């Protein structure tokens, strides 16, 4: 495992999802918005504490180089499971254990991704490795944990 141009591109896409005003930096406001779209309601202090742990130039916001350094790191995310479980619950709004096409579309829209019907259907198809037309938690985990 080494840093690749394809991974850098992928991380830039993820950075853009946070940097919704496209000014090149992630603020506390932007980080909190995304966290809310994914099932959490961080306090003001935790948002600034989170940014502080990677704000190398001390300007109080995260630029792409800082974000990249954080995403490329050899870590082993000890908080991974919790985050992925909360995210699953946001997708699975009716709590039936399966993410439907409507459910996926809803969350993607709130993340700023106005997916076409074809994209929604493709996303479900990619994840639905058991072929029952919907995405269960184990299937969701595979999509979330891919590197």
């Amino acid at each position: 495992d080494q840093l690749t141009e394809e991974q850098i591109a992928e991380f830039k896409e993820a950075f853009s999802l946070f940097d919704k005003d496209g000014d090149g930096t992630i603020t506390t406001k932007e980080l909190g918005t995304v966290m809310r779209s994914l099932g959490q309601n961080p306090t003001e202090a935790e948002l600034q504490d989170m940014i502080n742990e990677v704000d190398a130039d001390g300007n109080g916001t995260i630029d792409f180089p800082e974000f990249l350094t954080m995403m490329a790191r050899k870590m082993k995310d000890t908080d991974s499971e919790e985050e992925i479980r909360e995210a699953f619950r946001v997708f699975d709004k009716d709590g039936n254990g399966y993410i439907s096409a409507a459910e996926l579309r809803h969350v993607m829209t709130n993340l700023g991704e106005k997916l076409t019907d074809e994209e929604v259907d493709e996303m479900i198809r990619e994840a639905d490795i058991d072929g029952d037309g919907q995405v269960n938690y184990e299937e969701f985990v595979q999509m979330m944990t891919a590197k």
């Binding site: 992928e10 991380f11 896409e13 993820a14 999802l17 946070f18 980080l31 995304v34 966290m35 994914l38 959490q40 935790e46 989170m50 940014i51 742990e53 990677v54 974000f67 954080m70 995403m71 790191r73 870590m75 995310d77 000890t78 908080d79 991974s80 919790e82 985050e83 992925i84 995210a87 993607m108 993340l111 991704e113 997916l115 994209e119 996303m123 990619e126 994840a127 999509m143 979330m144 944990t145 891919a146």
Partner: peptide, 20 residues
Amino acid sequence: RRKWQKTGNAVRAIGRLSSM
């Protein structure tokens, strides 16, 4: 896997910022 990876990376970023 474009959109799933973006979503995954967003969750992973939040998890890593929270851990570090």
